[PDB]
Amino acid sequence: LDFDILTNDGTHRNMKLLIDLKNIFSRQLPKMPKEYIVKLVFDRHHESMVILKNKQKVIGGICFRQYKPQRFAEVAFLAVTANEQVRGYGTRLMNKFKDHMQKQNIEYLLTYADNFAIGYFKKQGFTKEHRMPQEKWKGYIKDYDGGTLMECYIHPYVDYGR
Ligand SMILES: CC(=O)SCCNC(=O)CCNC(=O)[C@H](O)C(C)(C)COP(=O)(O)OP(=O)(O)OC[C@H]1O[C@@H](n2cnc3c(N)ncnc32)[C@H](O)[C@@H]1OP(=O)(O)O
């Protein structure tokens, strides 16, 4: 079981994996326009960390976008395939992601969660109250009046994915 950052480098291997991830996202986030998922997963600003089983099968992942100078990242999509849920993978994935963000010098994660997903994020340390001022991400991350913007601080010397 590996947690690798997938790069859209135009190779058959990585491309297949990103498509596989994309299909998991659309399956688990049914109300999300599939063409939109495709757009973000394959654009040049987004990266995806996948849960790789047997070094070939994608069973879940997180698609995110780093705003490097600002030191924050938005979690665009997150999911574990249905037949692999409730096995601790979702949590292991987030811990691996936080460890990576810490190494990438990212200070905060932001994500718009679906009412049903809010609980998962709260479990991972995300909160509805923000320690980061609105002015800071405004202009980089879209401000939707109809979703719940959640935030998670990534401490520079806390041991994640331990
Ligand atoms: C921006 C984002 O995309 S928002 C949408 C997030 N994605 C989804 O909702 C997609 C559908 N869901 C999924 O793909 C999965 O259920 C995930 C990623 C939410 C969680 O993955 P799993 O492999 O099942 O996670 P894992 O088993 O490690 O979770 C363990 C803990 O998370 C909690 N948890 C997981 N899913 C949920 C949920 N939907 N609601 C509430 N709590 C949840 C478990 O209750 C558990 O609590 P515990 O450790 O005290 O027992």
TrEMBL record:
Signal peptide: none annotated. It is found in: Nucleus. Belongs to the acetyltransferase family. GCN5 subfamily. CoA 1 binds at L78, V80, Q85, V86, R87, G88, G90, T91, K123. It comes from Tetrahymena thermophila. Acetyl-CoA binds at L78, V80, Q85, V86, G88, G90, T91. CoA 2 binds at L78, V80, T91, F116, A117, K123. It comes from the Eukaryota. This is histone acetyltransferase. Residues 5-155 form the N-acetyltransferase domain.
